[PDB]
Amino acid sequence: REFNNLTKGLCTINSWHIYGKDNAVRIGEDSDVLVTREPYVSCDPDECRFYALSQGTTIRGKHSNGTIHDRSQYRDLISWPLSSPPTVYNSRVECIGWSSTSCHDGRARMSICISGPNNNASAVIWYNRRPVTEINTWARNILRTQESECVCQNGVCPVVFTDGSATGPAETRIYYFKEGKILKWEPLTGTAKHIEECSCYGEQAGVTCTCRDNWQGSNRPVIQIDPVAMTHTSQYICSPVLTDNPRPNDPTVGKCNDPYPGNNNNGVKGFSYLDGGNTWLGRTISVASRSGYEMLKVPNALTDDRSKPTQGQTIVLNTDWSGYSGSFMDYWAEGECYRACFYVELIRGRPKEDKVWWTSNSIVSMCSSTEFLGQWNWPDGAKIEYFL
Amino acid sequence: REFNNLTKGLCTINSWHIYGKDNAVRIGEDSDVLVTREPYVSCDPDECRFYALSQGTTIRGKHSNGTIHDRSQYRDLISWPLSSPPTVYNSRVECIGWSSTSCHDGRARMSICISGPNNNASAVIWYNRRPVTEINTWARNILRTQESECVCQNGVCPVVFTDGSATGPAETRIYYFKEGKILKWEPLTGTAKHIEECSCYGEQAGVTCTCRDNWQGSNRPVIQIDPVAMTHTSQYICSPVLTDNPRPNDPTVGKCNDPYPGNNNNGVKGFSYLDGGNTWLGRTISVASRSGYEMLKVPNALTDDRSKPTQGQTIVLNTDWSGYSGSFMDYWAEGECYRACFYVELIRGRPKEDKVWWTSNSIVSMCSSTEFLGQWNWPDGAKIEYFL
Amino acid sequence: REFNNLTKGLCTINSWHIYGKDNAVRIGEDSDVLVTREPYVSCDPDECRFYALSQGTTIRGKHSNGTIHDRSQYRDLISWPLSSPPTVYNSRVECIGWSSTSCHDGRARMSICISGPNNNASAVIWYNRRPVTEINTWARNILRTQESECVCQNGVCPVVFTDGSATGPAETRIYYFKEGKILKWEPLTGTAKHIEECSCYGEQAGVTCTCRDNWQGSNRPVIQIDPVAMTHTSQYICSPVLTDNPRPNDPTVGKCNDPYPGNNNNGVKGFSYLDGGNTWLGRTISVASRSGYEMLKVPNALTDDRSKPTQGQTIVLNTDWSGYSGSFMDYWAEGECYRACFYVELIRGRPKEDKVWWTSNSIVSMCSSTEFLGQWNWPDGAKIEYFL
Amino acid sequence: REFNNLTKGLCTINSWHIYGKDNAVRIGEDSDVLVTREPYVSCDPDECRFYALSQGTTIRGKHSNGTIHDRSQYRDLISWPLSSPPTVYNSRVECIGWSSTSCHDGRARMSICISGPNNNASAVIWYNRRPVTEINTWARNILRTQESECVCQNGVCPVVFTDGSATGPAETRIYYFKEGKILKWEPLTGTAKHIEECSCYGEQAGVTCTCRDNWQGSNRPVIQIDPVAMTHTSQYICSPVLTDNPRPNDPTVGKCNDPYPGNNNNGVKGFSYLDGGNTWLGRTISVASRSGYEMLKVPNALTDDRSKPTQGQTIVLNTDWSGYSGSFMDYWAEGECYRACFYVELIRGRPKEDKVWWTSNSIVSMCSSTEFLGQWNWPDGAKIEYFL
Ligand SMILES: *[C@@H]1O[C@H](CO)[C@@H](O[C@@H]2O[C@H](CO)[C@@H](O[C@@H]3O[C@H](CO[C@H]4O[C@H](CO[C@H]5O[C@H](CO)[C@@H](O)[C@H](O)[C@@H]5O[C@H]5O[C@H](CO)[C@@H](O)[C@H](O)[C@@H]5O)[C@@H](O)[C@H](O[C@H]5O[C@H](CO)[C@@H](O)[C@H](O)[C@@H]5O)[C@@H]4O)[C@@H](O)[C@H](O[C@H]4O[C@H](CO)[C@@H](O)[C@H](O)[C@@H]4O[C@H]4O[C@H](CO)[C@@H](O)[C@H](O)[C@@H]4O[C@H]4O[C@H](CO)[C@@H](O)[C@H](O)[C@@H]4O)[C@@H]3O)[C@H](O)[C@H]2NC(C)=O)[C@H](O)[C@H]1NC(C)=O
Ligand SMILES: *[C@@H]1O[C@H](CO)[C@@H](O[C@@H]2O[C@H](CO)[C@@H](O[C@@H]3O[C@H](CO[C@H]4O[C@H](CO[C@H]5O[C@H](CO)[C@@H](O)[C@H](O)[C@@H]5O)[C@@H](O)[C@H](O[C@H]5O[C@H](CO)[C@@H](O)[C@H](O)[C@@H]5O)[C@@H]4O)[C@@H](O)[C@H](O[C@H]4O[C@H](CO)[C@@H](O)[C@H](O)[C@@H]4O[C@H]4O[C@H](CO)[C@@H](O)[C@H](O)[C@@H]4O[C@H]4O[C@H](CO)[C@@H](O)[C@H](O)[C@@H]4O)[C@@H]3O)[C@H](O)[C@H]2NC(C)=O)[C@H](O)[C@H]1NC(C)=O
Ligand SMILES: *[C@@H]1O[C@H](CO)[C@@H](O[C@@H]2O[C@H](CO)[C@@H](O[C@@H]3O[C@H](CO[C@H]4O[C@H](CO[C@H]5O[C@H](CO)[C@@H](O)[C@H](O)[C@@H]5O)[C@@H](O)[C@H](O[C@H]5O[C@H](CO)[C@@H](O)[C@H](O)[C@@H]5O)[C@@H]4O)[C@@H](O)[C@H](O[C@H]4O[C@H](CO)[C@@H](O)[C@H](O)[C@@H]4O[C@H]4O[C@H](CO)[C@@H](O)[C@H](O)[C@@H]4O[C@H]4O[C@H](CO)[C@@H](O)[C@H](O)[C@@H]4O)[C@@H]3O)[C@H](O)[C@H]2NC(C)=O)[C@H](O)[C@H]1NC(C)=O
Ligand SMILES: *[C@@H]1O[C@H](CO)[C@@H](O[C@@H]2O[C@H](CO)[C@@H](O[C@@H]3O[C@H](CO[C@H]4O[C@H](CO[C@H]5O[C@H](CO)[C@@H](O)[C@H](O)[C@@H]5O)[C@@H](O)[C@H](O[C@H]5O[C@H](CO)[C@@H](O)[C@H](O)[C@@H]5O)[C@@H]4O)[C@@H](O)[C@H](O[C@H]4O[C@H](CO)[C@@H](O)[C@H](O)[C@@H]4O[C@H]4O[C@H](CO)[C@@H](O)[C@H](O)[C@@H]4O[C@H]4O[C@H](CO)[C@@H](O)[C@H](O)[C@@H]4O)[C@@H]3O)[C@H](O)[C@H]2NC(C)=O)[C@H](O)[C@H]1NC(C)=O
Ligand SMILES: *[C@@H]1O[C@H](CO)[C@@H](O)[C@H](O)[C@H]1NC(C)=O
Ligand SMILES: *[C@@H]1O[C@H](CO)[C@@H](O)[C@H](O)[C@H]1NC(C)=O
Ligand SMILES: *[C@@H]1O[C@H](CO)[C@@H](O)[C@H](O)[C@H]1NC(C)=O
Ligand SMILES: *[C@@H]1O[C@H](CO)[C@@H](O)[C@H](O)[C@H]1NC(C)=O
Ligand SMILES: [Cl-]
Ligand SMILES: [Cl-]
Ligand SMILES: [Cl-]
Ligand SMILES: [Cl-]
């Protein structure tokens, strides 16, 4: 009944605890589980759910051949119950498309999916399970959005979109929606430039997004959004603890307003929680492939160009496949602070495991503890040989 | 709690955006999807659902052999969640039969199903999930109805039925129901010479139906119904943009008050939105077979016998199978106008793809935008070789 | 919120219309459909459902081998949505056992199931989904009940049980329940000589049951119950239109107070609607086997020992398998009378089709119309060959 | 809306009636049933459900291979409707891990799952479907809890936890939670210190738990908890009817304050209802294998070291597999007492049936009757040879 306001700060993060795990690929070896990728998690006032882009086929089904491809007519944003797998029978379609975001504002949920050919894509903004607003491509080259949840404050939900070639004229915009309607949009300003796949969280009347720089992948760009003024700033994480993938090795000194020299072609969606001495960064363990995942406590990573880890937690061993990662919180939990959470996408199949013809994932998710908990590791758990 | 009244006009149609798509044939290659045909979409105040006639078997089931046939004791009207497939586990039976319609009046849903042998069929009218009224065949020759949603105003829901020859004069009746009871019926009047499979929508306290003249016409008949006076008139779409299938080639001048000659004893369910300058027609791209689908902006198509397209949008390529098409709208959405929507039945299997022994379909659905959106095309997406 | 009272009479029955049909055997050929038998239908104030005894296995499962047998530890009373099949995934277990009844009193549902070995069986009486009362075997020989719905008036629900052979020591009782608690029971009085598998309906503050006399199968015994006084009477249907199976051929003159001499210790559960000139009897078409099903209008069948048919309706052809049949009505429908309904069990597999190792069924169900509707026939529709 | 208080005593137990049975291994031979072990039952105010630890795979799935192991990253606590099987499509995940407990307080449900490697495990405590509190391992050796439901009084829910090696000996604590927050914990005082797998019930403002001695057991430890004072006592069951497994043969005289001489370390989770002359003990029939199950009425078992059976009931034949057992009650039923219930885990596959590569279970569950009812036996019912 009331729109949520971001009235709390983050809980103290002393470690991370298991929150959700779906075991999708294991279970899908002998049940009707949809092929997916680009998962996330998002909460309503009364429920938290798993989200992803379906490929319009089961994993065992013959149509799973070809699912390495990102964009097709057969994809849809689906949601399903926390830690259940995305099955044909339990998965609810939010909207049709191959790039998405979604968030609840306290009264109802906004979901956004983009569909089309690369040169003629469009977003449809759904609100309360009905289409409300559409937005045509402005740069005619893969209009695309966060692939994780947005965040609202008093009914205003900023969303980050990008359109444009990997090398070409790109334009990133922040749209501000309320009940699925456009209040305002703005082109990206500050020092962060060639941005995508923003992972956002809200606290203390502000939205923080950690993104990916598509021109040089090393230290991540950050957007700080004021949802009342409908303004933003941008910058890079200064810490020499680099969190894109592939990435150079960690130097001694990082960069605050430019990317640290990195590659151009193909980073990874990732996230962080930037909160002074309560700062944690996530990254893949490998510097070159989407393998492993760990969380590192890096006090003042945002502003301190010499900042190094003072604590850590392994999530996924380096001998296991990871993937995209992103932030979410339960903005409707009890208590005096918001508990940081995140998910890691555990990609199985193509290209790394090319004895199968499909690509899919499962999900692991964690939230923060004020305790210093023991750590385990959380693999996907399926055996590729079983699918041969 | 209150009956819906058709108080709004249509939104301006500047383009069509993706609404829903179930990918049912793809998915059903390896999951328990029911064989269907004659699908449609209908909204309740709090939800929109897909509808179709089940064939009482899944697609991989051996009882899928013989499913090209229309009429059997194993068919039922089913609904399921929007953009999900019609599965054995998520499909709710509305009623039993092989010709149907369904609509919600704001307070509850009326569903109608006809069953029986060709010479002894009967309609059962359900309201609030209970049978209320039955109507026996009046001409003993395949009693049949819309195969897409009806429309209500202040509790009054007109429905079009036909009984008699598909290839000659037959007896069409317009029934007016409230709460599943018959308020009145009328025989068809106006200049439409033959009527089947009306596709209807409501606005400004009237219902417009675009139908199929199976006897002689390749232009479509139109019924316009006043649900307050409980009266109707009929004519043809005057436009030389002919919308049945098979059909002759578009002439320069159409016919308003008689069927456009050239093709007899055949046709396909279709629809249009006939709103002055805001008029759009749907059709198969091919003139010979149920392949492709396009929307064409044809100002005043209803009344103007020389009207040609001023804009268009491809929905399904002519290299892909289409099928029936129909109109629906969400009469309980927010805003100041009703947004026009339609679906296209994407038929797969027999008779065009006769290496399988079944006939089934998937659904694609679109709604109007006030923007000028980029177009995609939306095939069924399944590979027939996978079913062999 | 209020207990239902039986305040209406029966609608005029001029024909029967299709109500529900699950096509369960067809569908279960390639989906996870539970093996069942002894089905029925029962309504809540807001929903009608299908009920049956599960066999704790799917049809295609290897444990379907041996499901000809009636009594095992793996059976339960399950309910599921009208006209869906009983699947693993959608079936709700009401209670455990191999004989059942169930009814709603207007405030909550009572369900009764019996389990045990033949010499030591017991009923558990559940109300509002919790067990309330239990009753031990009184004759130590297959304590058993209706296998169709009971009927309630002002919260009193009579239920007929039997315990004992058709030979040895044996006793039928009518228990009167309120909120699952025993008010009173009575041993069978009247001219009915043995009794099982009663099929009941309510009207004008009375419950009429048509039962099965398993010593001699010809004309059916009938129990008439006053749920206010909690007393009853019994007699036989006088009509020479005989309705059990196996049965002798129809004579000229029937018997009112004894069975017309019939096939010994064999039977089928059946039903009738007894209402003067508005009397209809159901029966198998075959006099030898559970084959075909018809409805016959036999005015004053209860009291007129020469009454023959004035009207009829074929439900299942004699070249198709039938089974148990029973009565139910929607006591919470709109209008001024109760509409008579029935179901027929369509038994497939053993013993009549022994190339499969299983026994299961599907359901067809009809309700009365005041119109004279055309007739179809409603076979199960599965092909046994497909299961080989 | 209110916290439940334990204001009632136990009903008189004169026999046990069938309550629920899921037939999970039978059904799962040909449907998507999840592999489980460590089941139990727990009620909310409006529903009772089955619970267990999933193994993150179906039984027919290839990942069922290896499911003899207890502790993996692929386990979760799931719940599903009473007497349905735990399927991929109807199981709801409560939390992730490999040891659990769950209970409702009248207002919401608390669920505790522990995960981690043997030396670094942690509990997350969920309340109203959100994580609230975490507890790290205190002895670094398989932190572990009840594996059946907890009981609440006025919002306070005691839970027993164990950490430590069985040869340590191990340490036990009682935590007292309210709304998922720790009110208090205390170490095990008294005569029984080496305790695990507590099965609890509530009555007359106190909680009684029957457990497994992990040091030197035969007879079972008992903890009596006062949830208001948040204090406890401990002793052993004096009776010479020994209810662990393996165990020596029943002696004439038992032991109240020390374990009866028997096995080293290993045992089985079990339960009792200790209520003076209305006292019943559960045990496996077999002295050495998890085979069979029986209830024995053993007056004053708790306090009388010569007490022997005055009445019994076979639940599972000795020639059939059993497993864990535990107590639960419906604290929200009608009437003046709480009705004692329990479940038995029916283990199939490894180690006993090693011709399959998996280990799973089904459930049978019973509630007490004040009647003297006939007994049956309730096997799992699956044929292993079907799975080969
Ligand atoms: C990103 O996405 C974008 C958004 O989707 C996409 O843009 C869209 O592109 C599509 C594909 O091009 C466009 O869709 C087409 O729209 C056409 C209509 O629009 C054009 O034409 C009209 C009208 O033109 C007449 O009128 C004007 C005004 O007087 C004259 O100036 C013209 O010369 C012309 O006059 C002729 O016709 C008159 C009667 O109309 C006669 O009186 C006269 O004498 C002449 O003969 C113009 O208004 C339009 O201009 C406006 O928009 C354009 C952009 O498109 C601007 O450049 C311009 O400045 C204006 O703003 C425009 O030119 C449809 O006609 C077209 O559909 C036909 O073609 C397809 C095949 O392509 C057929 O499938 C379809 O059936 C239609 O053709 C059949 O039917 C007609 C009618 O009977 C027949 O004449 C024709 O021969 C053909 O018949 C044959 O096939 C039939 C089918 O099988 C069969 O049944 C018959 O029997 C027969 O065999 C199509 O829908 C779409 O609108 C664009 N949308 C927008 C918003 O721009 C963009 O491309 C995307 N980007 C990328 C990179 O992909
Ligand atoms: C049960 O569970 C618990 C709870 O989880 C387990 O305890 C946890 O154990 C893990 C594993 O050890 C710890 O994670 C590591 O944390 C460290 C940070 O902590 C260390 O450093 C702190 C800071 O030191 C600085 O300050 C001090 C004084 O101020 C000064 O002395 C020092 O020199 C420096 O200036 C120390 O404060 C801290 O000490 C404290 O904690 C100790 C226990 O951890 C305790 O003994 C102490 O007494 C004290 O209280 C401690 O020394 C992270 O640095 C580390 O992360 C690095 O290592 C992992 C591999 O382990 C790697 O994957 C990470 O990426 C990272 O290393 C890379 O990045 C570095 C930064 O650039 C770079 O230097 C490295 O060369 C390396 O980079 C290379 O690889 C990366 C990745 O591939 C690549 O990108 C690069 O380019 C390059 O090739 C871990 O996160 C947990 O914190 C700890 N938790 C707790 C609460 O204790 C416990 O072990 C479990 N028990 C059992 C039995 O198993
Ligand atoms: C479209 O749909 C419509 C609607 O469904 C279809 O029309 C329906 O058609 C069916 C099929 O014919 C009819 O069902 C049969 O009904 C008759 C009863 O109606 C007839 O008899 C009435 C009574 O006659 C008596 O009284 C009158 C005066 O009252 C007197 O004149 C007369 O001489 C006699 O003494 C007549 O009133 C009635 O006439 C009326 O209706 C006619 C329409 O039918 C109309 O033309 C007339 O103008 C008039 O208005 C009519 O003549 C049932 O008797 C019959 O049931 C018997 O036969 C079937 C086989 O068809 C069998 O399965 C039944 O069990 C039963 O016969 C067995 O039992 C008898 C009693 O013991 C016994 O005598 C028989 O020998 C036989 O016994 C053997 O078999 C059984 C079973 O296996 C075994 O147990 C025994 O031992 C033994 O071996 C049918 O139910 C419908 O009533 C009719 N509905 C309507 C509204 O019309 C229409 O056909 C469809 N259209 C198309 C084109 O397909
Ligand atoms: C229809 O269903 C109904 C209802 O369910 C069926 O009726 C039920 O029938 C069963 C099976 O008979 C009964 O269960 C048994 O109950 C007895 C307890 O009752 C007996 O003992 C009572 C007390 O006896 C003592 O006191 C009296 C004086 O008070 C003294 O005289 C006597 O010598 C003794 O010292 C008697 O009061 C009681 O009699 C009453 O009831 C009778 C009917 O049962 C009736 O005839 C009488 O007139 C009177 O009314 C009765 O005789 C349990 O003891 C028994 O459980 C033991 O036996 C089973 C094997 O069957 C075993 O599995 C159990 O563990 C247990 O035996 C083990 O433990 C003992 C204790 O330590 C030990 O001493 C045993 O040697 C044995 O130990 C061995 O095995 C275990 C496990 O493997 C192992 O751990 C040890 O190390 C060792 O190796 C049964 O539970 C039901 O109570 C009864 N219910 C009712 C209401 O009647 C009916 O039969 C069904 N009808 C049909 C047709 O099927
Ligand atoms: C939320 O915060 C805004 C400030 O921008 C305030 O106007 C609004 O009243 C607050 N919403 C409530 C009362 O929940
Ligand atoms: C709907 O419109 C009718 C007139 O056609 C009017 O009488 C009725 O009051 C309206 N329904 C409501 C209550 O919205
Ligand atoms: C039902 O009938 C009884 C009398 O037999 C009456 O007292 C009771 O209140 C009635 N229930 C209603 C009004 O629904
Ligand atoms: C439950 O009992 C407690 C005693 O600890 C009491 O204080 C509280 O008021 C009771 N709550 C109720 C009435 O539900
Ligand atoms: Cl592998
Ligand atoms: Cl193909
Ligand atoms: Cl057959
Ligand atoms: Cl076996």
SS3 annotation, A127-163: ECCEEEEEEECCCCCCCECCCCCCCCECCEEEEEEEE
Interface contact flag, A96 B382, Cβ < 8 Å: no
Residue to mutate (ligand 3; options B120, B143, B163; most atoms within 8 A of CB)? B120
**CA of D95 to nearest chain A CA: how many angstroms apart?**
7
Locate B182 and state its tokens.
């018959």
C-beta separation of B244 from B221 below 8 A: no
Q: Are strands B122-127 and B130-136 parallel, antiparallel or unpaired?
A: antiparallel
**CA of D33 to nearest chain C CA: how many angstroms apart?**
9
- Burial label for D337, CB within 10 Å (0-12, 13-18, 19+), is middle
For residue A115, give the nearest of B18, B84, B334 by CB distance: B18
For residue D135, give the H/E element and its range: strand D130-136
CA dist D55 and D68 (Å) reads: 10
In angstroms, the Cα distances linking D341 to B255, C117, D15, D209 are 78, 22, 11, 14
Interface contact flag, B122 C382, Cβ < 8 Å: no
Q: Which residues of A199-227 are buried (b: 16+ CB within 10 A; e: fewer)?
A: bbbbbeebbbbbbbbbbbbbbbbbbbbeb
Q: What is the largest CA-CA distance in chain A?
A: 55
CA-based nearest residue in chain A for residue B379? A73
Q: Is A1 on the interface with B (CB under 8 A)?
A: no
C-beta separation of D25 from D383 below 8 A: no
CA dist B210 and B273 (Å) reads: 8
Query: Percent helix, strand and coil across chain C, each rounded to 5?
Result: 5, 45, 50
C-beta separation of A374 from D117 below 8 A: yes
HSE toward the beta carbon, residue D306, CA cutoff 13 A = 0
- Burial label for D270, CB within 10 Å (0-12, 13-18, 19+), is buried
CA dist C75 and A236 (Å) reads: 65
Query: How many separate domains does chain B show?
Result: 1
C-beta separation of B23 from B85 below 8 A: yes
Closest CA to A90 of B37, D35, D87: D87
C-beta separation of A77 from A113 below 8 A: yes
**Does residue A311 have its Cβ closer than 6 Å to ligand 2?**
yes
Given B260, B293, B324, B338, the catalytic residue: B324
Helices and strands (H, E) in chain A, number of each type = 1, 23
CA dist B282 and B326 (Å) reads: 9
Neighbours of D340 (CB within 10 A): 26
CA dist C198 and C201 (Å) reads: 10
Contacts B89 to A, Cβ<8 Å: 89
Contacts C377 to B, Cβ<8 Å: 73
Closest CA to D76 of A91, A81, C36, B327: A81
CA dist A86 and A160 (Å) reads: 26
Q: Which residues of B85-102 are buried (b: 16+ CB within 10 A; e: fewer)?
A: bbbbbbbbbbbbbbbbbb
Backbone angles phi, psi at B116, to 5 degrees: 125, 175
**CA of C90 to nearest chain D CA: how many angstroms apart?**
9
Tokens 């049951």 belong to residue: C209
Closest ligand to residue B204's CA: 6
For residue A206, give the H/E element and its range: strand A206-213
In angstroms, the Cα distances linking D34 to A79, C151, D83, D132 are 21, 39, 14, 28
CA dist C57 and C69 (Å) reads: 13
- Burial label for D78, CB within 10 Å (0-12, 13-18, 19+), is buried
Give residue D182's Cα distance to chain centre: 22
Q: Which atom of ligand 2 is nearest to the CA of A312?
A: 91
DSSP symbol at C87: B
Please name the residues in contact with B272: beta carbons below 8 A apart, sequence gap of 6 or more: B199, B210, B220, B222, B237, B243, B279, B280, B281, B282, B301, B327
Active site residue A386: no
Residue to mutate (ligand 3; options C241, C283, C291, C296; most atoms within 8 A of CB)? C296
In sign, the C-alpha dihedral spanning A85, A86, A88, A90 is positive
**CA of A152 to nearest chain B CA: how many angstroms apart?**
21
Q: Which chains touch A (3 or more CB pairs under 8 A)?
A: B, D
For residue A89, give the nearest of B47, B48, B87 by CB distance: B87
For residue B186, give the H/E element and its range: strand B181-187
For residue D130, give the nearest of A31, A333, A383 by CB distance: A333
> B185: domain CATH number?
2.120.10.10
Neighbours of D173 (CB within 10 A): 17
CA dist B282 and B322 (Å) reads: 12
Note down the domain range covering C304: 1-388
Coil, strand, or helix at residue C259?
Answer: coil
Q: Which chains touch B (3 or more CB pairs under 8 A)?
A: A, C
Task: Provide the strand spans (E) within C4-46.
Answer: 15-21, 34-44
C-beta separation of D49 from D80 below 8 A: yes
Closest ligand to residue D254's CA: 4
Locate B202 and state its tokens.
């409501």
CA dist A239 and A259 (Å) reads: 11
C-beta separation of B303 from B3 below 8 A: no
C-beta separation of D315 from D344 below 8 A: yes
**Residue type at position B75:** R
Q: What angle do CA B148, B149, B151 make, to 5 degrees?
A: 145
CA dist A118 and D184 (Å) reads: 60
Locate C126 and state its tokens.
């559940």
In sign, the C-alpha dihedral spanning D82, D88, D93, D99 is positive
Binding residues of B: 37, 71, 196-197, 212-213, 217, 244, 266, 290
Given A51, A201, A236, A324, the catalytic residue: A324
Interface contact flag, D30 C124, Cβ < 8 Å: no
- How many Å lie between the centroid of ligand 2 and the Cα of residue A237? 20
CA dist C24 and C349 (Å) reads: 13
Hey, of B59, B89, B90, which one would you mutate to test binding to chain C, going by the most C CBs within 10 A of its CB? B89
Coil, strand, or helix at residue D74?
Answer: coil
Please name the residues in contact with C158: beta carbons below 8 A apart, sequence gap of 6 or more: C150, C151, C174, C175, C176, C177, C200, C207, C225, C227, C230, C232
CA dist A92 and C380 (Å) reads: 33
Neighbours of C65 (CB within 10 A): 14
Locate C230 and state its tokens.
């909690």
HSE toward the beta carbon, residue A285, CA cutoff 13 A = 16
Sheet of strand C196-203, all strands in order from the earlier edge strand to the far edge: C196-203, C206-212, C221-226, C231-236
Q: Is A57 on the interface with B (CB under 8 A)?
A: yes
To one decimal, the resolution in angstroms is 2.2
C-beta separation of C42 from C55 below 8 A: no
The alpha helices in chain A, defined as continuous H runs, are 24-28
C-beta separation of D73 from A381 below 8 A: yes
Sheet of strand D206-213, all strands in order from the earlier edge strand to the far edge: D195-203, D206-213, D221-226, D231-236
CA dist B106 and B110 (Å) reads: 11
C212 marked as binding residue: yes
In angstroms, the Cα distances linking B9 to A127, A130, B67, B161, B371 are 21, 18, 40, 26, 18
Backbone angles phi, psi at D317, to 5 degrees: -65, 150
Q: Which atom of ligand 7 is nearest to the CA of C4?
A: 14
In angstroms, the Cα distances linking D46 to B162, D108, D280 are 49, 11, 28
Contacts D29 to C, Cβ<8 Å: 57, 61-63
CA dist C113 and C117 (Å) reads: 14
Locate A201 and state its tokens.
């969280």
Tokens 């735990």 belong to residue: D86
Task: Provide the strand spans (E) within D167-230.
Answer: 171-178, 181-187, 195-203, 206-213, 221-226
Closest ligand to residue A204's CA: 5
Sheet of strand B311-321, all strands in order from the earlier edge strand to the far edge: B272-273, B280-283, B291-297, B311-321
Sheet of strand A181-187, all strands in order from the earlier edge strand to the far edge: A157-163, A171-178, A181-187
CA dist B218 and A151 (Å) reads: 52
Closest CA to D30 of C68, C60, C145: C60
The alpha carbons of chain A give a radius of gyration, in whole angstroms, of 19
Backbone angles phi, psi at A296, to 5 degrees: -130, 130
Closest ligand to residue A29's CA: 9
B-contacting residues of C 97-136, CB under 8 Å?
none
**CA of C108 to nearest chain B CA: how many angstroms apart?**
20
Helices and strands (H, E) in chain B, number of each type = 1, 23
C-beta separation of A239 from A247 below 8 A: no
The alpha helices in chain D, defined as continuous H runs, are 24-28
Tokens 């991989």 belong to residue: B60
Q: Which atom of ligand 3 is nearest to the CA of C287?
A: 85
DSSP symbol at B153: B
What approach was used to elucidate this structure?
X-ray
C-beta separation of A369 from A376 below 8 A: no
Please name the residues in contact with D373: beta carbons below 8 A apart, sequence gap of 6 or more: C122, C134, C136, D14, D15, D16, D17
Closest CA to A381 of A32, A85, A15, A66: A85
Closest CA to A295 of A308, A280, A310: A280
CA dist A368 and A265 (Å) reads: 33
Q: Which residues of B279-293 are buried (b: 16+ CB within 10 A; e: fewer)?
A: bbbbbbbebeebbbb
Locate C18 and state its tokens.
């299709």
Give residue C197's Cα distance to chain centre: 7
Please name the residues in contact with C341: beta carbons below 8 A apart, sequence gap of 6 or more: C19, C41, C327, C328, C329, C330, C365, C366, C367, C368
CA dist C152 and D370 (Å) reads: 26
C-beta separation of D326 from D339 below 8 A: no
For residue A82, give the nearest of D72, D93, D120 by CB distance: D93
